[PDB]
Amino acid sequence: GAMELGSSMQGQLKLGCIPTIAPFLLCDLVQEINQRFPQLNLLLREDTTTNLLTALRHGELDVLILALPVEIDGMESRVVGQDPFKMVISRHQAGAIKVPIKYDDLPDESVFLLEKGHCLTEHAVSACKLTDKEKINPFSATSLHTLVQMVANGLGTTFIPQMAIDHGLLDNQNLVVIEPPGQQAYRDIGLVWRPSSSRSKTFNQLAEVVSELL
Template identity: 60%
Template sequence: MKNLPSLKNLYYLVHLHQEQNFNRAAKICFVSQSTLSSGIQNLEEQLGYQLIERDHKSFMFTAIGEEVVERARNILTNVDDLVELVKNQGEPMTGEIRLGCIPTIAPFLLSRVVKLCQQDYPKLSLLLKEDTTERLLDALAKGELDLLILALPVDTSGFHSMKVGIDPFKMVMHKEASEQFLQPIDYQKMPDESIFLLQAEHCITGHAITACQLGDSAKINPFAATSLHTLVQMVN
């Protein structure tokens, strides 16, 4: 049998890549810095390639090192899945599910999801993470999350996706102002800087700009909110 790399050393490598610091990676792995460094050197010897270029004060991953990290991350994720499969054999909807959700959905949905899971699946533990679409997709790709709740359209190539609900796209305005505009609204006829949106990192902002054909329109107010609640208060 081939002398295969140990999961422990792959674990060290993945966390070093994640932290980009030997000391922090060692703390996360609950080992000394020398143990982590030795494990990665053993991994390099087994593979026969240099994964990290080192000097006295810094280091960087080689091209093959980057590829090994990605494959190691997938291997560790598959091993975790294997353990969960065996642990939950014959008893579905038990164990842990790491669920990510974007901030424009989380406040309105997650509390109900948690309540229903506690009622119907008491042995299922939901670990929740709220973040932007880009960061959640990155965490999913790295195996740090199992499921995401996002607002489409989003590039989900490489993942399995399905629609679980549809929310209407609405514009909120003051009651007095709403009487000035006919349906459907012609956004180009609205006053300059009269449209308030979330910060650009929120996907709903891009969706709104596309749906309303705003582009770099002067109609958009330079103020960018961090939450939908703030936007509603700006209308009031």
């Protein structure tokens, strides 16, 4: 984009994204858009899932980038890729917890999770088969950065999306990336927008670019 644009993939686009995707995925999306579609100014809103859906319905955003599945009511969605889940612990408790990790052998009030309202918590404990709630610590986190920082202090473990690890969220925090126990875990990444939109061809070309980054 540019500060000044002159006279489908051109113009302005208001995009919403969740706090568990925006810091890690939108960095590479901007560099692709800067080169492929130079005259596409891209404005960004980072908010939780239900708030972004409200902003889309009220016409304040043109398209969303969410983690699926979530209740989207009547909007149109397109999955563009999958984002694996991993577990992280510090190297102080690397001997206190065995790999392959198993939930029932862990001490309880050790699994830290984000505040409800972040779709990551419900997606993690569903993709990863975390059924024993007593594992979960009562103190819930309010951001993904502070969630990793508590795990870096050795207070337990958590589930981290792969795109955050690829972006370097765990850098210099002395952590180990452990495969999640049980069954395979991941989350769907898709674009959400209203059916009453003439920019369907603009959203789908962008959905192809996001599909290449995953």
